[PDB]
Amino acid sequence: PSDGSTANLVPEVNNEVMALEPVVGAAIAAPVAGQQNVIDPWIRNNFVQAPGGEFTVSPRNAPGEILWSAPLGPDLNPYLSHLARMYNGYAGGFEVQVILAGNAFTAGKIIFAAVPPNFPTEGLSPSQVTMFPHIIVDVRQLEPVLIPLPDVRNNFYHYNQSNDPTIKLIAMLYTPLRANNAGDDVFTVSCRVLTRPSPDFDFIFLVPPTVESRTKPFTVPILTVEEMTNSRFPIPLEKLFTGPSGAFVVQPQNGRCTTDGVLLGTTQLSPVNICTFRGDVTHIAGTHDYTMNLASQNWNNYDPTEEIPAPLGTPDFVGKIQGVLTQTTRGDGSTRGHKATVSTGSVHFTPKLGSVQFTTDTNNDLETGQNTKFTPVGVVQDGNSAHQNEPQQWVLPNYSGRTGHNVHLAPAVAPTFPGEQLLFFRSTMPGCSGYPNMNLDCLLPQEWVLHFYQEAAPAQSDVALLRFVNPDTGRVLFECKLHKSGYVTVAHTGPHDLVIPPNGYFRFDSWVNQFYTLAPMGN
Amino acid sequence: NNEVMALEPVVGAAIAAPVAGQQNVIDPWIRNNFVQAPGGEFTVSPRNAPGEILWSAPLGPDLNPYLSHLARMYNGYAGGFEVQVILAGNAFTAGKIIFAAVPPNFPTEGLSPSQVTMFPHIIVDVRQLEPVLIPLPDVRNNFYHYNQSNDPTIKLIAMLYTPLRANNAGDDVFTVSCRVLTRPSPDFDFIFLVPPTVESRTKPFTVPILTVEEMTNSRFPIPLEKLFTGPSGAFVVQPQNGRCTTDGVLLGTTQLSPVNICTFRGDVTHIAGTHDYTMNLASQNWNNYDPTEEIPAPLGTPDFVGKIQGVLTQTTRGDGSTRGHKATVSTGSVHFTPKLGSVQFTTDTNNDLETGQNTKFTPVGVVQDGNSAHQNEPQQWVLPNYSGRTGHNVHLAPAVAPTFPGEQLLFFRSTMPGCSGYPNMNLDCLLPQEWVLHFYQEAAPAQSDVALLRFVNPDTGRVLFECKLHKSGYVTVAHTGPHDLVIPPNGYFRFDSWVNQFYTLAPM
Amino acid sequence: NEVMALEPVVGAAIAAPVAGQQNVIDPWIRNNFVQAPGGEFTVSPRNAPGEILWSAPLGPDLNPYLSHLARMYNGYAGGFEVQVILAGNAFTAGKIIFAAVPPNFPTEGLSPSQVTMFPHIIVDVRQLEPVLIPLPDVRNNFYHYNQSNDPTIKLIAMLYTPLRANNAGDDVFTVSCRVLTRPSPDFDFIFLVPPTVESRTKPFTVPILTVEEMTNSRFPIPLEKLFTGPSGAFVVQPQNGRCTTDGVLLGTTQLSPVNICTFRGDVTHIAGTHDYTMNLASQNWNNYDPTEEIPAPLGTPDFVGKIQGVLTQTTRGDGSTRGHKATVSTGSVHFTPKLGSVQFTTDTNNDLETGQNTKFTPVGVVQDGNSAHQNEPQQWVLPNYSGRTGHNVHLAPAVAPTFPGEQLLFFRSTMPGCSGYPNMNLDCLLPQEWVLHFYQEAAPAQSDVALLRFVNPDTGRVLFECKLHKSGYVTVAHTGPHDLVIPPNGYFRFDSWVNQFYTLAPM
Ligand SMILES: [Cl-]
Ligand SMILES: [Cl-]
Ligand SMILES: [Cl-]
Incomplete structure (x- = not known):
């Protein structure tokens, strides 16, 4: 029966079984629930891959890392996820199926464990995980692993909009992945998690769909790189770039947005106001300089007491940006x-305090009482110093000049996983004079910021796995990790401009955690 | 008046079986033996009048040290207790005590005796010899309780219903001592086995074993010297360093490092024509300082008005x-504005402090201008103006005063070094820095507003005094008048039980 | 084949006529295997026959549930069932022997032939099903007391045949092993007792404090970074911040984090100079006794260098x-703190009266700028506490790694400089807060090495593990000098007592 297929090289099924009692589902809730609802029986009889149903065991992983985890709830099943947007509550358990059909030349063990509600998951060691109901499975296991997940609780049922905790299912690497195939290959174990609701699972109260926050599903815009625009300067995107970031510090304040739609740093929604200034202008006698007293981005008064590092859309690099001052008299x-x-490295560039300084081409012809708008165009470079050194995109200006220090900054960003580098959305700024460093890298396209902002989908885990697809051929070009913090990472070493089909798009495939091992992408 | 409490039967953990993860077992000896709660003592005296609540406790594992230790390895529980109360009377006394079951989420604060009778209750005579057995059921609106959620539970209340009438015996005054014992009912059980000592709300509260001499003042980097209590009506006791709550929340300007307590770090700038320098501050960790923080000033900013002398230190990277x-440093100067990010030092040089370089003020002591009144300049109980004249002090830690008649604050006192002049070198803090460290790391939940501490001589075993450690960052004792305490050099503080703020402590 | 040649051994049933009471353990604890805290070891092709890969004595510390329960019981009796898991595959060869070593027999030095002479099992590296080993409570009394630390049977895991396997690429194939335990049916606890009174049951812990939140134990300054390096040239033998895991202070170590380089006493002028002599009095202001079995008064500086600070004095009346x-110059011949006298250089020869108490508050270190830069403060050279008139006495031992690939782990701070070009590096073996913690929470050491894990709480990831030795020093797996790159909120977490052969993963 196995002759020539698997060939007894591989464990067949697991004998281990989780030491959990049976637990009632939604039946207990019937006297106090508003309604008794029904789930399509096909959904209850057929395993389907869970949102966030991919994880990997690779040689980069170390024992103790939680490779996969999820709380009990409708988000365990994509059909139930869509359904949950139509209901107010739920109760009952799941059947989860884990596929671990690794190559026979690999070794390693995974522990699956059920941790009860209100126990902190943060910091558990493998020693400790063994103290919960648990199952230890070999990474070569051939038949899928069946784990029943009961709805342990102290109430009749759960509300979608509340924060009461549920059982969490945890998969943690118990033994490191080892392999003894003779070749110079890496046999990563690609794993899949599928689920279906137990017969005791049920939804509770029918309610208007898409209204409730915690049920909105996460999506990623279908737009092409060329069709999107840079989030740090009002210009289109041009290419995708990855490179090492050990020398410099990646800490932009524009194009900073979290997956569930919280804006960060100086980030705002309009792609045109990304390096604009509006306010009243004043001449400095004897020079071509003017001092601009800043209004808000919508022409309201500017409040320096806002918990923002600078007014929204303030440039987030040091350099001299050339544009045009425009003014209109209301009479x-x-x-x-x-x-x-405008020079952002100048000591008089103090937007947090309310004032910015321009150098113009006139000593007059700019009224004092009129509203004035700086429309940016490009960057310039002092030609007598070293070539390509003036616009330092990864050097933050001092938003309060020499006075004080920068505050309320969006965090810095760096790769966290071995072999991984940031993935930058690169645009080329127009040069206006000299030999300026025209490369401009942002962490998220502005259209993604808009999308995340409007669709405030809660993150199911800290990383969304994306695959970049050529729709003409159907092929995957690379895969990448989109972190909640609003940045993308890829598995590559060295600088590289990506060679991208003009129609390529990002496709959201699974929720993963920071330990997911990405396929090699470079070249 | 009866011996039976008008309570219906109340299910314990049996109801939770369909929704609990597992079924557990408690050692049967624990279920068959009454055990005294650490604060399961109270006294009936002729001073007591009707309406006074002599003792109270909520249902939970903390009434029983065995169950309390067991709970550190379990996730939840459900079910009630059997309470045993022992009355040390004799036939020649008279008076009544009421015990009452108050249901979850009802306020105990303010009941009259008439009203307490309106709960399920028992009326017990002071002459009762046989112990009183009270069932304490786990009235609730869920299947069971989680340790980490702190659900409210039923309370037992003991109140004086009729005053005690008895002859005295000489000048010793007769009192009825009462003790409260407990054991779990058969319907009580734990629910889910979890890795022990992880769940924060099950850690027991403790107080460091250190001796006063071995501890450190929390307001200046110097060792402690003595314990001092005094009346505090004249001034306002409101320090901002060494302010920490029993469950480990730091308050005011308090931080953990005992050496960074009166230090400053930042970049320094010369003031033309003077020997003065202006320091633009960082944090204690050399990071940017954020004036928008919900703190009065950067952590470790001095919390008194005076002139602190020390040493500025600087190192060039090249x-x-x-x-x-x-x-x-003068903390009363108008140029002492650490909330805004700037402090002014008066130095011994006009040339030798470079710009852009990191600079550290190491404090040493306090100084006094000898031409003014002796012992007048360092005012420990006067807060600086952290933003000098641009506003008022913000996000201050609360002021501290005794509320119980006969009680005064207990201060941990050291002597600040004097560098010049005739300065007032007394420095009192509310908590030793080591206690702050201890409370912060061991985030033990406070079971009430007061932790009862006893001061012990470890050689003889004797208790010298008891004091009340309030959940807030301060200690009180029973004394009147200023007094330096007479302490054995190896004496330490020991935690005995949580009590309620009505606890009346024995004088010295 | 897979059966250990042991007779049955009665557990707590035999103790019933002499035990005070009969107790019950939660049956879930009895039916579920739990990993022993140090129940991991690895089989690598570098291993040779005879190497002891893992060992443990029978007892409650093998099981965190039983370990917690023992804090409320007076004694125990009975055995365990051990489950050992091997992460092999069909393409491997090699044998491991597990052996039961009786209570008072030394494991130290056994050859592979001899280990075979105990009750034993020989397990092939390819075995998939977990190995079940009964570990009986062989003893000569009715039961064990927690406070009497009776010796028990030991499980031994030794490499019997070398591992034969291919590698994949540059990753070398290794068989990871895990040891799981659960109480036998005949195991039971004995006498209920107050839950945290008994000393020998207190578990060892390490403060949750951050490196930045802790303090150097050799000078009154905060810590700044973690540093590991090779130490073969010099002698690492500090006398401050030296404390054992179970809370015994060593050398000149004391508890106050501010008195770490202070001096107090009455002062005397030396005629014609700016020098003063201080007649030292104890840190608690008492009479000083030189007879104390200490190298010097507690808190005396433990390095050779010039420490600049401030002398303070107060006239009582x-x-x-x-x-x-x-x-203060610690290398000057007039630095004799063991005898009771130290010499200061001040900025005045006037205005320091006699009979008055005087306190030196340290601030930093200083350097003679005309000499070689970074040459004056030698942190790893001890001063001569008795000057020329004798040698240092009662020192804390010197410290060095014993395992190939291991170096000391130092808690590093940067001393303030006052003048010149001094070596501002200051390394201590233990943070002062760790000294405080060990001293108060006097947890007995279950072996010579406490395995610690250093965790980044943001990501949950473990950055490295290190060995905290009972003697009070830390070692890590690294070669070469290196400042550790640590998240500012990282903390040390205690994982397990392990045996002296435990091999930790490199950085
Ligand atoms: Cl709708
Ligand atoms: Cl403890
Ligand atoms: Cl609390």
């Missing part, structure tokens, strides 16, 4: 427009 | 050059 | 106060 409609340049 | 200069 | 910049 006659006279209009004036003059070449102008 | 060559490793180092410079050190005598310096002095 | 008038209340006057004086303060003067001052400097």
Whole structure:
């Protein structure tokens, strides 16, 4: 029967069984629930891959790392996830199926454990995980592992919009992955998690769909790289770039947004106001300089007491940005427009305090009482110093000048996993004079910021696995990790501009954690 | 008036079986033997009047040290207790005590005797010899309780219903001592086995074994010297360092390092024509300082008005050059604005402090201008203006005062070094820095508003005094008048039980 | 074949006529295997026959549930069932022997032939099904007391045949092993007792404090970074911040984090110079006794260098106060703190009266700028506490790694500099808060080495593990000098007592 297939090289089924008692589902809730609802029986009889149903055991992983985890709830099953947007509550357990059909030349063990509600998961060692109901499975296991997940609880049922905890199922690497195939290959174990609701699972109260926050599902825009725009300067994207970031510090304040839609740093939604200034202008006698007293981005008064590092859309690099000052008089409609340049490294660039300084091409022709808008165009470089050294995109300006220090900054960003580098969305800024460093990398396209902001989908885990697909051929070009903090990572070493089909798009495939091992992508 | 409490039967953990993960077992000896709660003692005296609540406790594992230790390895519980109360009377006394079951989420604060009778209750005579057995059922609205959720439970209340009438015996005054014993009912059980001592709300509260001499003041980097109690009506006791709650929440400007207590770190700038320098501050960890923080000032900012003399230290990264200069900070100066990010030092040089370099003020002592009144300049109980004149002090830790008649604050006192002049070198803090460290790391939940501490001589075993450690960061004792305490050099504080703020402690 | 040649051994049933009471353990604990805290070991092709890969004595510390329960019981009796898991595959060869070693027999030095002479099992590296070993409570009394630390049977795991396997790429194939335990049916606890009174049951812990939140134990300054390096050239023998795991202070170590380099006493002028002699009095202001079995008064500096600070004095009757910049040279022949005298260099030869108590507050270290830069403060050279008139006495032992690939782990802070170009590096073996913690919570050491894991709480990831030795020092798996790159909120977590052969994963 096995002759020539698997060939007894591999464990067949697991004899271990989790030491959990049976637990009632939604039947107990019937006298106090509003309604008794029904789930399509096909959904109850057929395993389907869970959202966040992929994980990997690779040689980069170390014992103790939680490779997969989830709380009991409708998010364990994509059909139930869509259904849950239509209900107020739930109760009952699941059947989960884990596929671990690793290559016969691999070794290693995984522990699956059920941790009860209100026990902290944060910091558990393998020694400790053994003290919960648990199962230890070999990474070569051929038949899927069946884990029943009961709805241990102290109430009749759960509300979708509450924060009462449920049982968590945990998969942790118990033994490191070892392999003895003779070749110079790496036999990572690709694993899949499938689920179906137990017969005792049921939804509780029918309610208007898509309204409740905690049930909105996460999505990623279908737009192409070329069709999107940089989030750090009002210009389109051009290529995808990965490189090492050990030398410099990646800490932009524009294009900073979390997966569930919280804006960070100086990030705002309009792709046009990303390096604009609006306010009243004042001449400095004897020079071509003007001092601009800042209004808000919508022409309201500017409040320096906001918990923001600077007004929204303030440039997040040191350099000299050339554009045009434009002004209109409210009485006659006279209009004036003059070449102008702002230096963000200048000591008089203090947007947190409310003032910015431009150097213009006039000593007059700019009224004091009129509203003035700086429209940016490009960057410039002082030609007498070293080539390509003036616009330092990864050097933050001092938003309060020499006074004080930068506050309320969005965190810095760095790869966390062995072999991984940041993935940058690269645009080329227009040069206006000299030999400026025109490379501009942002962590998220502005259209993604817009999307995440409007669709406030809660993150099911800390990383969303994305695969980049060529729709003409159907092929995957690379896979990457989109972190909740709003940045992308890929598995590559060295600088590289990605060679991308013009139609390529990002496709969300599974929720994963920071220990997911990405397929090699480079070249 | 009866011996039976008007309570229905109440299911324990049996109801939870369909929804609990597992079934557990408690050692049968624990179920068959009454055990005294650590604070399961109270006294009936002729001073007591109707309405006074002599003792109270909520149902839970903390009434029984065996169950309390067991709970550190379990996730939940459900079910009630049997309470045994022992009355040390004799036939020649008279008076009544009421015991009452108050249901979850009802306020105990303020009941009249008439009203307490309206709960399920028992009326017990002071002459009762046989122990009184009270069932304490786990009235609730869920299947069971989780340790980490702190659900409210039924309370037992003991109140004086009729005053005690008895002859005295000489000048010794007769009192009825009462003790409360407990054991789990058969319907009590634990629910889910979990790795022991992880779940935060099951850690027991303790107080460091250290001796006063071995501890450190929390307001200046110097050892402690003596314990001092005094009346505090005149001034306002409101320090911002060494302020920490029993369950480990830091307050005010309090931080953990005992050496960074009166230090400053930052970049320094010369003031033209003077020997003064202005320091733009960092945090104690050399990070940017954020004035928007919900703190009165950077952590470790001095919390008194005075002139602190120390040494400014600086190191150049390029060559490793180092410079050190005598310096002095006035915390009452208008240029002492650490909340805004700036402090002013008066140094012994006009040339030798470089810009852009990291600079550290190491404090040493306090100084006094000798031409003014002796012992007048360092006012320990006057807060600096952390933003000098641009506003008022913000996010302050609460002020501290005794509320119980006959009680005064207990201070941990040291002597600040004097560098010049005739300064007032007394420094009192509310908590030793080692206690702050202990409370912070061991985040033990407070079971009530007061932790009863006893001070013990370990050689003889004798208790010298008891004091009340309030959940907030301060200690009180029973004494009147200022007094330096007479302490054995090896004496230490020992935690005995949580009590309620009505506890009246024995004088010295 | 898979059966250990042991007779049955009665557990607590035999103790019933002499035990005070009959107790019950939660049956879930009896029916579920739980990993022993140090129940991991690895089989690598570098291993040779005879190497003891793992060992443990029978007792409650093998099981965290039973370990917690023992804190409320007076004694125990009975055996365990051990489950050992082997992560092999069909393409491996090699044998492991497990052996039962009786209570008072030494394991130290056994050859493979001899280990075969105990009751034993020979397990092939390819075995998939877990190995079940009964571990009986062989003894000569009715039961064991927690407070009497009776010796028990030991399980031994030894490499019997070398591992034969291919590697994949540059990753070398290894068989990881895990040891699981659960109480036999004849195991039981004996006498209920107050739950945390008995000393020998207190478990060992390590403060949750952050490196930044802790303090150096050799000078009154905060810590800054973690540093590991090779130490073969020099002698690592500090006398401050030296404390054993079960809370015995060593050398000149004391508890106050501020008195770590202070001096107190009455002062005397040396005529014609800016030097003063301090007649030292104990840190608690008492009379000083040189007979104390200590190298010097507690808190005396443990390095050779010039420490600059401030002398402070107070006149008792008038209340006057004086303060003067001052400097102590620990290598000067007049630095004799063991005898009771130390010499300061001040900035005045006037204004320091006699009979008054005087306190030196340390601030930093100083360097003679005309000499070689970074040459004056030698942290790893001890001063001569008795000057020329004798040698140092009652020192804490010197410290070195014993395992190939291991180096000391130092808690590093940077001393303030006052003048010159001094070596501002200061390394201590234990943070002062760790000294405080061990001293109060006097948990007995279950072996010579406490395995610690260093955790980044943001990601949950373990960054490295290290060995905290009972003698009070830490070692890590690294080669070469290296400042550790640590998240600012990382903390040390205690994992398990392990045996002296435990091999830790490299950085
Ligand atoms: Cl709708
Ligand atoms: Cl403890
Ligand atoms: Cl609390």
